[PDB]
Write a protein that binds this ligand. Structure first.
Ligand SMILES: [Cl-]
Ligand code: NI
Ligand code: NI
Ligand code: NI
Ligand code: NI
Ligand code: NI
Ligand code: NI
Lengths: 230, 230, 230
């Protein structure tokens, strides 16, 4: 069974052909994240966007493991030239790349992508994105941080989805209503997993309300550390 | 009757539960704005995007009044860490937050969002946005600065609109044909108010051309200072 | 016959009412581009976004020719205030402007828009855009660098397209499958020209796979220097 686990906020982990992939590795500064910077093994890191709660420990993790960081062209240049990360792969929206683990395709999201420096100036890191993985015959749609958009149904029709990770926190993303609508109306995956809630007071939600509002496929409310059952 | 008035370019003012809310306060540097920084009373400032003709007097207005500034996460960081604004609430697209005035939900726009510093370098302030307010049983859709997009119909279906503020200036936003198509095809509000024209030579339009081309609901051509008649 | 030519990556050149317009002038540093910055004559330069492979020689080209640079508000601010470019016209998505050559209208794209200064800090230059030209009775849709989006069909239905320039390079934009779907399903132009391939190893594509996959209108595989046959 394909290995795919949730680890708090928008952090997911998966294996394809014995290669380890993490998304949005907010580990050391998320007390609800079950992962440890010291012990996690990865060959690749994929970033949906540059916000602190996704960017997280990418620099320290990339350096320690020698993992390749996949993201926007701006993100790749930033990690490379500002942070000195040796192994980066720049991409953009609609772009697909084949790696030894499987494929990464970046899709559109509605949000922002920046990392705020000490002077208070946000450093722009491209348009925010979602990820479509094809790994061991499974199609995984991580929506990233996003508002509701009708082209979610274009992404899902062109890439029928096994597992969708969808933010339900509200304030900074879709809340319960928009995220359930996204699943019911546009994505219709076999498995839905809600993400990006409870990490901060502002995004505390009852994921049961999400599960009650979803009428299509299976909803799996994964706590940090738990894996998707296929 | 709910208090809702236009003050030139994209500046709207409203009252909910006796709290005063201003959007995109371009006051001191807009000669056609009937408002004055010294006398304007506000509890909340909402910014659709960072451009000078929307950002306007937010810093000086926020310190004089102690008003809370609601905007993108980047806007909140920038205003707080760079300009030292005391009271900010960071949000992002698809996010909804409940205040004592009513609710504010950010939605997508197609435009840009930055404030250009002395040296010609823009500061990135997120993706540009529109606003859905629910205030005193009214749904208000300020589209912000945007081009035409079909998800205007999704925003409107999910949040049936009482008043829509829609830019008609062209060059920088929708002109007459697109704005009127947005109203007739996608949004279909009870009341349409054209905004973002005549302030500069480049965005001079006859709003009567807009009202002529709209076939749905009621078009109220408001001069700065004039309120919406419900 | 109206003059319209492809010069590698996303560089196009056209003439209307004896005025010369270039798009994304990446000349000096593209070895597959047949143009020479010393001999290139233009009255107008149009920028879809700020990536180096589009920005290209805009500053040197603009000063030598006195050409007006048309782009995003941010691009206009940046070229003017930072680079001292004399003649700029700021626009934004959905905005249309009439020139002696014909009309330019900016439309949305899904990509990023920056130019990187030292140490991997991007200068933000707005949302990335496509262009709708109306020149000597022809409608040209340059999609810019973009992923697939359904509003390609709104743009094409509101502005029926004679020539579409569409990226097929993949990784950083649509690849073969997405680009051919865009043409077949959404744009349906008289003529399709694939762009943004072969220039770098990462974006190497056989444009015959695109032509075989397109079922609507005529596909013209232009080598750098070749012109559209109407
Ligand atoms: Cl759409
Ligand atoms: Ni975020
Ligand atoms: Ni987030
Ligand atoms: Ni603006
Ligand atoms: Ni504006
Ligand atoms: Ni690009
Ligand atoms: Ni490019």
């Amino acid at each position: 069974m394909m290995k795919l686990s949730f680890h708090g906020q928008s952090t997911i982990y998966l294996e394809g052909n014995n290669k380890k992939v993490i998304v949005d590795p907010f580990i050391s500064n998320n007390p609800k994240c079950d992962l440890n910077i010291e012990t996690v093994q990865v060959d690749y890191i994929v970033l949906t966007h540059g916000h602190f709660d996704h960017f997280g420990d990418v620099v320290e993790l990339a350096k320690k493991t020698g993992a390749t960081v996949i993201g926007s062209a701006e993100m790749a240049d930033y990690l490379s030239s500002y942070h000195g990360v040796e192994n980066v792969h720049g991409m953009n929206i609609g772009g697909k790349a084949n790696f030894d683990f499987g494929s990464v395709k970046f899709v559109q999201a509605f949000h922002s992508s920046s990392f705020t420096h000490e002077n208070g100036i946000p450093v722009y890191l491209g348009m925010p994105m979602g990820i479509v993985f094809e790994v061991e015959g499974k199609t995984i749609y991580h929506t990233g941080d996003t508002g509701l958009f009708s082209d979610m149904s274009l992404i899902a029709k062109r890439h029928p989805v096994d597992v969708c990770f969808v933010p339900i926190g509200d304030n900074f993303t879709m809340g319960i209503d928009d995220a359930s609508y996204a699943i019911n109306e546009f994505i219709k995956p076999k498995i839905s997993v809600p993400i990006h809630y409870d990490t901060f007071p502002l995004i505390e939600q009852d994921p049961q309300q999400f599960k009650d509002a979803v009428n299509v496929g299976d909803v799996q409310i994964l706590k940090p550390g738990e894996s998707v059952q296929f």
